[PDB]
Write a structure and sequence with these properties.
The complex is a heterotetramer of chains A (110), B (111), C (175) and D (9). Chain A has strands at residues 2-4, 9-12, 18-20, 23-25, 32-37, 44-49, 55-57, 62-67, 72-77, 86-93, 99-101, 105-109. Chain A has a single domain (1-110), classed as Immunoglobulin-like, CATH 2.60.40. Chain A contains no helices and 12 strands. By secondary structure, chain A is mainly β. Chain B has one domain (1-111): Immunoglobulin-like (Sandwich), CATH 2.60.40. Helix content of chain B is 0%, strand content 50%. Chain B has strands at residues 4-7, 10-14, 19-25, 31-37, 44-49, 56-57, 64-67, 75-78, 87-94, 99-101, 105-110. In chain B, the strands form 2 sheets. In chain B, strands 2, 4, 5, 6, 9, 10 and 11 form a 7-stranded mixed beta sheet that branches. A 4-stranded antiparallel beta sheet of chain B has the order 1-3-8-7, with no helix packed on it. The N and C termini of chain B lie far apart (34 Å). Chain D has no helices and no strands. Classes of the chains: A mainly beta (110), B mainly beta (111), C alpha+beta (175), D little secondary structure (9). Chains in contact: A-B, A-C, A-D, B-C, B-D, C-D. Chain C: It is found in: Membrane.
């Protein structure tokens, strides 16, 4: 139905931890995804959550935590690199399994 | 990932021009999707397909036509290009749940 | 008492007609409460019990939309099974899906179901654990592998443990 | 509310 990324832009130092926020509002069962998009490229999967352990490990040092109570799926990385500068999208699975995307959060690592 | 590829990579069209975007997937996924992204922000669903011979209007289908002649190919047609249709178009395939995206097609429609 | 909800989706392909016959029937305990048939003049989910008359037109609309997509799922997946079993594209074949939930007296999930049968025979079935699959033969082995890889069990489990149980309770209150 | 859209066979 819908996902909301409250922070449109985040700036962090190289080597700092990263925390990206996502909130969903979906009556049905929430299938959640985090994608990354680099310049001149398409979205690439980072990780997903279907059920079970609410903490899921993903590609390239990312992990996320599902919280039914807060309707959130926050993304995290402990030590960001300059190469992590990109746009991050939170997504929820809908009709016919089409993904509905958030507006995205641009990450800048100085 | 070179599993989902789009053609052309870049296109400049004039208003009223008929433009066709092509997508090939080697994933053998039944489902295919066309999205557009205007300002490196939200990707919005234009058309999708359940398999060969299937074409379904997405969130923003007005101004497009789609064609799924086979498992691997899903094309998107702008019948009469309008400036509002300039953006980056992304194709995706899926066997359920995870979508796999092409690298994108930059389309500019001249004002 | 122990209650259950069950859906049975079946599609039968026929010779010549590009669209298979698709049906879907729901059950709360022993009672058929909902049904969709593709042969009908205006295919839609219609109630089969008086206590289902209290659902808004929005309910019937999205449920029917889903059914329309299911038809498309079956259409495509019937064709992939032809490939798996090396069968002729000019024959008659059946694919049946069953899913649902059994709840205890405490309204919590006991057993979840997600299973398919091809031509009356076993194909693939989600196990009690809701984590692993039982494949009937080598063809069903191709599906198991991709579903293990894609995390299909986790996907189905999310529905079976939540929305299924919650809707069952909803229908029980209605009845 | 029915099952979400199933994965490819």
């Amino acid at each position: 139905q819908s996902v909301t990324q409250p922070d449109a832009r985040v700036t962090v130092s190289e080597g700092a931890s990263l925390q990206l926020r996502c909130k969903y509002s979906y009556s049905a069962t929430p299938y959640l995804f985090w994608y990354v998009q680099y310049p001149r490229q398409g979205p690439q999967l980072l990780l997903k959550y279907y059920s079970g352990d609410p903490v899921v490990q993903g590609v390239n040092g990312f992990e996320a935590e599902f919280s039914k109570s807060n309707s959130s799926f926050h993304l995290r990385k402990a030590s960001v690199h300059r190469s992590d500068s990109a746009v991050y999208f939170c997504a929820v699975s809908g009709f016919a399994s089409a993904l509905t995307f958030g507006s995205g959060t641009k990450v800048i690592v100085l | 990932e070179a599993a989902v590829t789009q053609s052309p990579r870049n296109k400049v069209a004039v208003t009223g021009e008929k433009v066709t975007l092509s997508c090939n997937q080697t994933n053998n996924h039944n489902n295919m999707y066309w999205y557009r992204q205007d300002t490196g922000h939200e990707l919005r669903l234009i058309y999708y397909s359940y398999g060969a011979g299937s074409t379904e209007k997405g969130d923003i289908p007005d101004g497009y036509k789609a064609s799924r002649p086979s498992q691997e190919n899903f094309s998107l047609t702008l019948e009469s290009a309008t400036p509002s249709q300039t953006s980056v178009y992304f194709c995706a395939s899926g066997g359920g749940g995870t979508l796999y995206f092409g690298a994108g097609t930059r389309l500019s429609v001249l004002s | 008492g122990p209650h259950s909800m069950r859906y049975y989706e079946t599609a039968t392909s026929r010779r010549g007609l590009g669209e298979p016959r698709y049906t879907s029937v729901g059950y709360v305990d022993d009672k058929e409460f909902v049904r969709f048939d593709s042969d009908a003049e205006n295919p839609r989910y219609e109630p089969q019990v008086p206590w289902m008359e209290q659902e808004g037109p929005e309910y019937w609309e999205r449920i029917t939309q889903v059914a329309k997509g299911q038809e498309q799922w079956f259409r495509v997946n019937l064709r992939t099974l032809l490939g798996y079993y090396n069968q002729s594209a000019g024959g008659t074949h059946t694919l049946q899906r069953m899913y649902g939930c059994d709840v205890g007296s405490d309204g919590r999930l006991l057993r979840g179901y997600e299973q398919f049968a091809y031509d009356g025979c076993d194909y693939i079935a989600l196990n009690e654990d809701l984590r692993t699959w039982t494949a009937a033969d080598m063809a069903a082995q191709i599906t198991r592998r991709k579903w293990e890889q894609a995390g299909a069990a986790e996907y189905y489990r999310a529905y079976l443990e939540g929305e299924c149980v919650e809707w069952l309770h909803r229908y029980l209150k209605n009845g | 509310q029915l099952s979400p859209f199933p994965f490819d066979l």
